[PDB]
């Protein structure tokens, strides 16, 4: 806005898994106001995550996010008759947002049948550094680390 | 409207489904309410004028 920053909304702790990271995942899965539907998908995929490791699922979730959080994004800027990308530093609570969007997004177009086994397989493949969500992490990094020459115009 | 059509709608037509309503002030064939007998236009001046009781502008 013209008049400075807006207050951001607090997320209440998730009752089944006592963490605000789970309730920040259910709002990315949420479509059309189906929040009790969106929580059955997230809870159901996290129960399937411990059925393939035995480990606690939110520890697997935080290992899955740490492999897909970007550190450098590649925002665009025009100067004269040419454009380029400036590598800028991702503030941390944007990197939480931008990584939860990649896990939900790249697993909606994944090859399984239901959304529970699509979301759970993307979490397990990201907590090992294998999935397509991990692939966009280094594609975001290789794009931004190919443009260090333009890191001197940071607004 | 045309003055023949205002008198025709007042009388008793053949084939009673053939009847309809007009505005009691200007004789307009469309947008006539049944509670008032008036069109959308003649309702709007008469409500601002306070000439029909109970009706005023609503805000909520």
């Amino acid at each position: 806005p013209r008049k400075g920053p807006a207050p951001k909304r607090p997320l209440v702790n998730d009752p089944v898994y006592g963490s605000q990271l789970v309730t920040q995942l259910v709002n990315k899965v949420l479509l059309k106001g189906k929040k009790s539907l969106a929580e059955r998908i997230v809870y159901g995929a996290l129960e399937q995550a411990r059925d393939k490791t035995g480990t606690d699922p939110v520890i697997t979730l935080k290992r899955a996010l740490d492999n897909v959080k970007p550190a450098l994004e590649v925002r665009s800027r025009r100067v004269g008759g040419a454009t380029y990308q400036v590598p800028v530093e991702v503030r941390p609570d944007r990197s939480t947002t931008l990584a939860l969007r990649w896990l939900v997004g790249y697993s909606r177009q994944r090859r399984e049948k239901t959304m529970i086994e699509r979301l759970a397989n993307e979490i397990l493949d990201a907590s090992n550094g294998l999935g397509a969500s991990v692939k966009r992490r280094e594609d975001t990094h290789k794009m931004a680390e190919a443009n260090r020459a333009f890191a001197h115009y940071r607004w | 409207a045309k003055k023949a059509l205002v008198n025709k709608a007042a009388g008793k037509p053949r084939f009673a489904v053939r009847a309809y309503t007009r505005c009691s002030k200007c004789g307009r064939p469309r947008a006539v309410y049944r509670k008032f007998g008036l069109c959308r236009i003649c309702l709007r001046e008469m409500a601002h004028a306070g000439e029909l009781p109970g009706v005023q502008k609503s805000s909520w």
Binding site: - | H48, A49, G50
Partner: protein, 207 residues
């Protein structure tokens, strides 16, 4: 145009309804003769200067309070027009009618009497700026008046192209709900068509 009616915007807050009845089923019945009484009075008694017409109806008994600036004219020679129009007001509704032609205390602090008096002068080939300043200066002489606006629009002296002119004295706060703003509209019957005369009178806030 752009400005709302000043009477409907303050209806139920400052000003008050003109028709005073109740009708759960006979509503369009009552409206259809409400718009027939007001045609008969406005076309035939225009020399008297009708301020307004109030119609309250109590179970087959309709009472008509008609206000005027000149109460002695419509009665005439001891009821030669008063009970005449009362006879045509019973041939209209088919019901016994109480009729009251009352008074206007000051017919210069009264819009719809100020606006009718200007358009009567506009139908006399009077210069329109001369007719508008007489109505304003006679209204600010009234005690409880804090403002008046008079607007005339039309062809304004037989000119080819139509235009609009207004004068004002005092203050006319049209956006104020607590204000007591009187309002009148009348239509001059000139030889070049029609000229609309509008009068806004401000008479203090609220009592």
């Amino acid at each position: 145009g752009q400005k709302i009616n000043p009477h409907g915007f303050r209806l139920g807050i400052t000003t008050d309804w003109k028709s005073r009845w109740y009708a759960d089923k006979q509503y369009a019945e009552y409206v259809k003769e409400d718009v027939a009484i007001r045609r008969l009075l406005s076309s035939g008694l225009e020399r008297a200067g009708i301020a307004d017409v109030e119609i309250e109806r109590t179970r087959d008994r309709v009472r008509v309070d008609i206000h005027t600036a000149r109460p002695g004219i419509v009665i005439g020679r001891r009821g030669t027009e008063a009970d005449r129009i009362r006879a045509d007001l019973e041939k209209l509704t088919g019901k016994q009618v109480q009729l009251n032609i009352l008074e206007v205390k000051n017919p210069e602090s009264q819009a719809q009497l100020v606006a009718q008096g200007v358009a009567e002068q506009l139908s006399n080939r009077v210069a329109f700026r001369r007719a508008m300043r007489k109505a304003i200066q006679s209204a600010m002489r009234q005690p409880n008046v804090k403002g008046i606006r008079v607007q005339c629009s039309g062809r304004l002296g037989g000119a080819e192209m139509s235009r609009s002119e207004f004068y004002r004295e005092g203050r006319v706060p049209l956006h104020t709900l607590r204000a007591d703003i009187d309002y009148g509209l009348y239509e001059a019957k000139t030889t070049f068509g029609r000229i609309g005369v509008k009068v806004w009178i401000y008479k203090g806030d609220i009592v």
